[PDB]
Write a protein that binds this ligand. Structure first.
Ligand SMILES: NC(=O)c1ccc[n+]([C@@H]2O[C@H](COP(=O)([O-])OP(=O)(O)OC[C@H]3O[C@@H](n4cnc5c(N)ncnc54)[C@H](OP(=O)(O)O)[C@@H]3O)[C@@H](O)[C@H]2O)c1
Ligand SMILES: NC(=O)c1ccc[n+]([C@@H]2O[C@H](COP(=O)([O-])OP(=O)(O)OC[C@H]3O[C@@H](n4cnc5c(N)ncnc54)[C@H](OP(=O)(O)O)[C@@H]3O)[C@@H](O)[C@H]2O)c1
Lengths: 223, 223
């Protein structure tokens, strides 16, 4: 069992999350950010892969003071729980996640992560250890549920999106499709990793499509 | 100068044209095929990369007898011109393109293609030679225009889509987004090749979005 899980990502018209240089580029405008901010404020937790933390160093904070005050007035942290999937415990001790905002941090690591680096992280985050050499996402999802995380927003990363989807852990997939072509066989897509074969394709159902600023927001139910 | 050029492709919700095994899978239903068939019947020419011919061996024919009869009654071939971008002249002499339907075939090759294989193709197609080691798409587009091809449908292939887009030859991009996740860092996307850097991103404008069967058809104007 697990929380309700949805992926929320912005991709170019050709399906890329960023350039081959893994440089993050303007895919969306203000209205799309507000929609993302609102989703963050609503979720119990936000999850991202270590690849995203290293490449972009995001805070994963709710930006609107009002949305933060509202969470606050509901007796919750100003920010939801912030989870990094990080097998080898590479999350830097001065990552922006640890610098900005109140709220719990969780680092999910594997049993093969450096025992001394864990200890350093345990000073500023909760560390959940799971899996042999890679985080066991199914197991992690179960523990997050048990901790009372009923809604989990995966802002992803190409490989983590794959991790979560191929493990059958996802309920819904939201893709803001921006008005640009990024290109490149090596640019990260909305779903990388190994890939499904013809015999394992994951079916979706379209729930909505909404033009927003210069792009379009598509939402699918998984299965 | 060049014909009016549009890319028409079907991709999974995560931007893939097919699986990592390069196996083609059901992305769309009947209505989407009818829309594709109508587009084929309307274009002067259809262009595909040699990777697609080798992987899928498509006929690139108009399937509807009525749409073929209508082209016919307008004094044209039942099928538009069928172009393969094929630097090394790998198009097989028994490819389905040569077996099915009337109409002109063109093979676009580079100046480094085997001189004897050209001759074999020239029996069943027109061969336009252009470029040193890879087909010069800009040059090709110019010759196709001169031949009176005013409308060119690129059904693509991941790498050819990149070729055409990065050469600035494309006016519009149509993507039927199907209700499935394919996944895989090595699965072909709507645009592979080298990829744009942050400084060379190609801007689009959304022209329409139309739910069709279980997917959604997005159309963009380039720039
Ligand atoms: N446009 C958007 O909305 C958006 C949002 C977020 C991110 N991004 C983009 O995503 C890009 C990076 O994506 P990415 O794939 O490199 O990084 P990622 O998906 O954020 O994280 C991937 C890493 O997670 C770790 N992991 C641990 N256990 C795993 C499991 N069971 N399954 C899958 N992964 C597991 C793996 O590394 P270890 O094994 O070393 O731990 C894996 O390489 C960035 O350039 C960023 O711009 C875009
Ligand atoms: N879902 C859909 O609507 C749809 C439609 C069509 C195709 N597809 C998929 O596309 C996949 C294959 O894509 P692909 O990238 O391998 O093949 P492709 O894009 O059809 O053709 C690529 C090849 O074109 C040749 N080419 C020659 N000059 C070029 C130039 N200037 N720029 C770019 N390419 C040039 C190159 O090989 P040489 O240098 O050897 O000539 C290149 O590798 C197939 O698996 C198929 O299922 C999907």
């Amino acid at each position: 069992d697990r929380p309700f899980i949805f992926i929320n990502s912005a991709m170019s018209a050709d399906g890329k999350l960023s350039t081959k240089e893994r440089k993050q580029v303007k895919i969306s405008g203000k209205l799309a950010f507000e929609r993302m901010d609102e989703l963050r404020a609503h979720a119990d937790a936000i999850m991202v892969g270590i690849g995203t933390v290293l490449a972009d160093d995001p805070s994963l904070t709710v930006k609107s003071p009002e949305r933060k005050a509202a969470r606050k007035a509901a007796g919750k942290s100003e920010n939801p729980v912030r989870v990094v999937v990080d097998s080898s415990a590479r999350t830097p001790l001065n990552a922006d996640i640890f610098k900005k905002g109140e709220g719990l941090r969780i680092i999910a690591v594997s049993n093969s992560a450096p025992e001394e680096k864990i200890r350093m992280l345990e000073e500023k985050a909760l560390v959940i250890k799971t899996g042999a050499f890679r985080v066991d996402l199914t197991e992690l999802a179960a523990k997050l549920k048990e901790m009372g995380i009923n809604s989990l927003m995966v802002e992803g990363g190409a490989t983590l999106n794959w991790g979560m989807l191929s493990a059958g852990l996802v309920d819904e997939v939201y893709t803001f499709v921006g008005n640009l072509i990024i290109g490149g066989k090596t640019a990260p897509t909305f779903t990388d990793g190994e890939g499904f074969t013809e015999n394992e394709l994951l079916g979706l159902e379209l729930s909505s499509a909404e033009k927003i600023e210069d792009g379009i927001l598509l939402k699918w139910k998984v299965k």
